């Protein structure tokens, strides 16, 4: 301890056979700034060990933090790294986390920063296990106020591949939805099962006027054993224009099973002049 400031340094070395433990902590005090570093490594075997490294630096109007740790168990591994920079009103958080066991590995990316009093965030997660990928992405610039959302979720597999994309904005007044989903289903248990997915949803809203439309096609063919050719083909689409002066809607429902089909036609009307609905229930059926 001196007029310059405190200094503290400590080292503890212990080892025997496969185990070696090298621990050191350097604590220095200098003026209006702090310096510290703890570099600790715990080796139990060449492929079986633990590493920790913490390094903190304090200076007027700025913070620097570094965190790096490493763990290994021969066939298994885990690593993580996180950066932290902070100064008045400015935040910058970034790093990596990665866990892996042989081929099966998971990759994660995280980066959070705040500038101009607006918070930005990006995360990326990808998993590749047993020859199957999953790609779900949360995109950048989720501000937090008058914000926006974007996403990209993708699953890939032999029996099934699924792709989902979404975008929407929560601005002060106007609203919008752009939802688009696609799924191909292939399955063979007790015959082939072709699960096809066509789902589109869109919505737009604004003061004193709302509108939307759902667009879905559902078709599935089942080639089950015993020469059973079964096709389930559902097709519904929706829409409606809404605003105080004029109001109406439409709903087209087409459903069929093999040779038997039903279709209903609906149109809803609500306007200054009139209100009315019209329905056409047409059926096709088998059997006596």
């Amino acid at each position: 301890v001196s007029q310059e400031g405190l200094k503290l340094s400590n080292d503890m070395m212990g080892s025997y056979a496969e185990m070696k433990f090298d621990h050191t902590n350097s604590l220095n005090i200098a003026g209006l700034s702090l310096d510290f570093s703890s570099k600790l490594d715990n080796i139990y075997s060449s492929d079986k060990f633990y590493k920790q490294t913490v390094n903190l630096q304090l200076q007027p109007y700025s913070l620097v933090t570094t965190l790096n740790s490493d763990l290994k168990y021969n066939a298994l591994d885990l690593t993580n790294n996180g950066k932290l920079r902070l100064e008045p009103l400015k935040l910058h958080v970034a790093g990596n986390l990665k866990g892996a066991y042989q081929n099966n590995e998971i990759k994660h990316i995280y980066a959070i920063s705040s500038a101009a009093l607006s918070a930005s965030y990006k995360a990326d997660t990808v998993a590749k296990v047993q020859g199957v990928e999953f790609s779900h992405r949360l995109n950048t610039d989720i501000a937090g106020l008058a914000s926006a959302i974007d996403m990209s979720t993708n699953y890939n597999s032999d029996s099934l591949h699924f792709s989902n994309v979404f975008r929407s904005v929560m601005a002060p007044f106007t609203m919008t939805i752009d939802a688009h989903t696609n799924g191909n289903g292939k399955l063979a248990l007790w015959g082939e099962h072709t699960g096809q997915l066509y789902s589109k949803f869109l919505l737009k809203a604004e003061p004193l006027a709302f509108t939307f439309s759902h667009d879905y096609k559902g078709s599935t063919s089942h080639h089950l054993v015993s020469r059973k050719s079964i096709s389930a083909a559902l097709e519904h689409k929706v829409s409606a224009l809404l605003t105080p002066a004029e109001q109406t809607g439409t709903w087209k429902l087409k459903t069929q099973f093999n040779n038997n089909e039903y279709s209903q036609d609906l149109d809803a009307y609500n306007t200054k002049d009139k209100i009315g609905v019209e329905l056409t229930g047409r059926t096709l059926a088998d059997l006596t």
């Binding site: 605003t243 002066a245 004029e246």
Partner: peptide, 8 residues
């Protein structure tokens, strides 16, 4: 569609 309010 745009908003429509008959006069008052």
């Amino acid at each position: 569609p745009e908003f429509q309010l008959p006069h008052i």
